[PDB]
Design an enzyme around this catalytic site. Structure first.
Site, PDB file in Angstrom:
ATOM      1  N   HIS B 121       0.838  -1.186   0.000  1.00  0.00           N
ATOM      2  CA  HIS B 121       0.000   0.000   0.000  1.00  0.00           C
ATOM      3  C   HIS B 121       0.880   1.245   0.000  1.00  0.00           C
ATOM      4  CE1 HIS B 121      -2.883   2.993   1.441  1.00  0.00           C
ATOM      5  NE2 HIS B 121      -3.854   2.142   1.166  1.00  0.00           N
ATOM      6  N   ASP B 198       2.943  -3.590   8.134  1.00  0.00           N
ATOM      7  CA  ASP B 198       1.694  -2.894   7.843  1.00  0.00           C
ATOM      8  C   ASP B 198       0.566  -3.890   8.073  1.00  0.00           C
ATOM      9  OD1 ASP B 198      -0.547  -1.640   6.759  1.00  0.00           O
ATOM     10  OD2 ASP B 198       0.290  -1.568   4.733  1.00  0.00           O
ATOM     11  N   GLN B 201      -4.699  -4.620   7.189  1.00  0.00           N
ATOM     12  CA  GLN B 201      -5.677  -5.541   6.627  1.00  0.00           C
ATOM     13  C   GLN B 201      -5.628  -6.930   7.263  1.00  0.00           C
ATOM     14  OE1 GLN B 201      -8.927  -5.499   4.742  1.00  0.00           O
ATOM     15  NE2 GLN B 201      -7.556  -3.981   3.805  1.00  0.00           N
ATOM     16  N   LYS B 224     -10.966  -0.098   9.899  1.00  0.00           N
ATOM     17  CA  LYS B 224     -11.105  -1.368   9.163  1.00  0.00           C
ATOM     18  C   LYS B 224     -11.501  -2.511  10.053  1.00  0.00           C
ATOM     19  CE  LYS B 224      -8.267   0.135   5.413  1.00  0.00           C
ATOM     20  NZ  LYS B 224      -7.076  -0.232   4.637  1.00  0.00           N
ATOM     21  N   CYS B 361      -4.753   2.248  -3.935  1.00  0.00           N
ATOM     22  CA  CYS B 361      -3.561   2.818  -3.297  1.00  0.00           C
ATOM     23  C   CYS B 361      -2.345   1.903  -3.430  1.00  0.00           C
ATOM     24  CB  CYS B 361      -3.816   3.138  -1.826  1.00  0.00           C
ATOM     25  SG  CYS B 361      -5.073   4.365  -1.558  1.00  0.00           S
TER      26      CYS B 361
END
Lengths: 405, 405
Positions: B121, B198, B201, B224, B361
């Site tokens: 991302h 990261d 998600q 999220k 993104c």
């Protein structure tokens, strides 16, 4: 301006604390929210929550409309020229940091001066400390008069032709001072400097006109003006914001992303990395609608009413020191003779009265006042003269109590 | 895990869009909130909103308890050792920026390498671009296999003894890939580098154990994972966070403030300048309680169910390309032969189905896939097989429709 009608809008007010009716007098630390704001948040999460700016499906379109409409309400609210000058941030601290990072650190050389004041909140001090450290520039302070106001001549003598930034509060969270932001902007511009207004404590209580103030940057926080926590605004003159590089990087702020290089978006989104504070900004727009419907000048009148009342009733108590000018915003910072402010605040909370005690994030000012700590009572648009009566009665009772020991 | 019971908890689901029942399949852009989260926010603003960390009056104490208890819930939720390793931020983008600013820019010299991947991302790309720019270091990319996964041998060959930072996604928002974060942490440590995950998600959909993953930094976003917008978390190993200087400066993060110098607070508050996102963090704690009561492994099982179902039903449509591995998280990124993804998304929204179209993104990944844009459908704990049936039926109808023109 019927204040019973206003108080019925804030559910948090109608409770008891330690057996007594709540008397919340700490709006300068944070304000309470009306049903309109809380219900704006509820409607958002119940009906049209989606990520913004990819107008692809219906809820995304509704959420984008809400977020950018909040931006437009903010533009009207402070009389900015363009939405491109209105940037959503985490709060005043972050906005000031963004100016310190993206303007100061890129435009400061050794010999350049950054001038602030002794009354400044820490948010408007430490970023400048770190920026002059990183650039080898000089940090200067405008001295205060003995009533805690700023003289224009002290400004003219402290800001020299080597000053590039003047950073100053609009309203002091401790002294109640309203600083001469407009004249100071003229003085800073005459010397070739920009002016950065910490407007955290002015925006909730009085009308803001960035065109009339001619400030180059203006920072504000939603939580002090009936809005959700976690959101605030940076205003910068569009011309300045065009030449500043972003303080944060990621999605939503880029145009083209290569393996090693990227190009940015146009303003304002150049300065909004990541998924934005969608719900918080829409709730801030609701807060703005609420205030505008009450009328900001009526809110100013109410606060001047309460502040004059508070000063007169405090002068009716012996052995209480009030700090700051007579012309002020709706807050009284004070101390009791031979009673520590933390103790005052504790006994007042036992009476259900909420005040703050400590340095109020203004340690240099505390040292300048020659005290280590202070008590503070802060008023807003839901506070009454009866509540100030209760405050001064409890202060009298506190001083009698600590005399009988 | 009864999913009718779960869907009845999300009011936003029970509406119509353009005459059709809403089929929200865009949780990878942002998720919806259950009543527990929204009502946590309501209770906060209705009952105990006050500024935190000056335990002086009752509402201040209640709000501080809520905020720091949210911090503790986050610590348990990702199995961090100490609350000092849990820092509240604006979101994943800001957390990654904070590592890029306070770790990368202070520990990078020319010749040092920062390695990322082609599937990252933008939030996990541009901060590193800017940091290697500011330090003269080198940015390197780990190549991808033809199914969009990462080979451990490609990792070992790309990360050299000159690598100081490896930055990588836990789960890809585009390909659905679950990356071998644990093995990659071992490989990065063997070469003397830190690893920055990261986790934007992965956190909503699967259990996180930073001790088992042995990641040095982990970033996550509340919006999220059923939580309020505007809040996220940075996890860093306490030892690393002690030697990093703050990314932001102001009140609440200082100890002593002089005219020119200040000292910081202990962790975590060293990295939280200003009034924090109080309501947002407490709501994130509510989101965590909600997920833990459903059970994260049950949520993972549900998503694997829906993803296997979606892949099998997509392979029942001719002329549809699905990108990425077969082993995946609950999302399908795809394209229709001779139909632009924006058009697919528009017709699906006319059917009341919410998908995303664009680059998600991840422009370098789009170029690597040799496409300019994509459509994506994303599943979460409130989504059903009936909804995927509707998606594939509408995709078939879309392709018939664009064939008859």
């Amino acid at each position: 301006m019927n204040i019973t009608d206003i108080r019925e809008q804030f559910p948090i007010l109608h409770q008891q604390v330690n057996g007594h009716d709540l008397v919340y007098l700490d709006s300068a630390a944070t304000s309470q929210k009306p049903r309109a704001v809380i219900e704006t948040l509820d409607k958002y999460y119940n009906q049209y929550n989606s990520n913004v700016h990819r107008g692809v499906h219906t809820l995304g379109t509704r959420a984008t409309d809400g977020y950018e409409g909040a931006r437009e309400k903010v533009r009207k609210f402070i009389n900015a020229k363009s939405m491109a000058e209105i940037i959503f941030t985490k709060g005043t601290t972050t906005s000031l940091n963004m100016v310190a990072l993206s303007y100061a650190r890129a435009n400061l050389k050794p010999g350049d001066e950054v001038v602030i004041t002794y009354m400044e909140h820490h948010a408007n001090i430490i970023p400048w400390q770190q920026a002059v450290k990183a650039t080898g520039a000089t940090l200067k302070y405008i001295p205060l008069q003995e009533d805690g106001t700023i003289s224009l001549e002290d400004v003219r003598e402290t800001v020299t032709s080597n000053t590039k930034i003047v950073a100053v509060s609009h309203v002091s969270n401790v002294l109640g001072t309203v600083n001469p932001i407009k004249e100071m902007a003229k003085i800073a511009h005459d010397n070739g400097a920009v002016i950065v207004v910490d407007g955290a404590q002015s925006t909730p209580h009085m009308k803001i006109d960035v065109q009339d103030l001619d400030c180059d940057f203006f920072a504000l926080s939603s939580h002090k003006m009936c809005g959700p926590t976690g959101v605030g605004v940076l205003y910068g003159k569009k011309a300045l914001l065009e030449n500043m590089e972003p303080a944060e990087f990621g999605g939503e702020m880029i145009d083209f992303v290569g393996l090693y290089e990227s190009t940015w978006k146009e303003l304002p989104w150049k300065f909004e990395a990541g998924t934005p504070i969608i719900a918080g900004a829409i709730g801030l727009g609701a807060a703005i609608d609420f205030l505008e419907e009450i009328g900001l000048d009526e809110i100013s009148r109410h606060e001047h009413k309460l502040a004059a009342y508070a000063l007169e009733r405090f002068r009716q108590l012996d052995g209480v020191t009030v700090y700051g000018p007579e012309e002020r915003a709706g807050l009284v910072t004070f101390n009791l003779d031979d009673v520590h402010p933390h103790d005052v605040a504790t006994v007042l909370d036992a009476e259900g009265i909420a005040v703050r005690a400590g340095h109020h994030c203004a340690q240099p000012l505390m040292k300048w006042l020659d005290v280590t700590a202070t008590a503070r009572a802060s008023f807003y648009l839901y506070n009454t003269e009866e509540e100030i009566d209760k405050l001064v009665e409890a202060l009298q009772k506190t001083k009698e109590y600590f005399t009988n020991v």
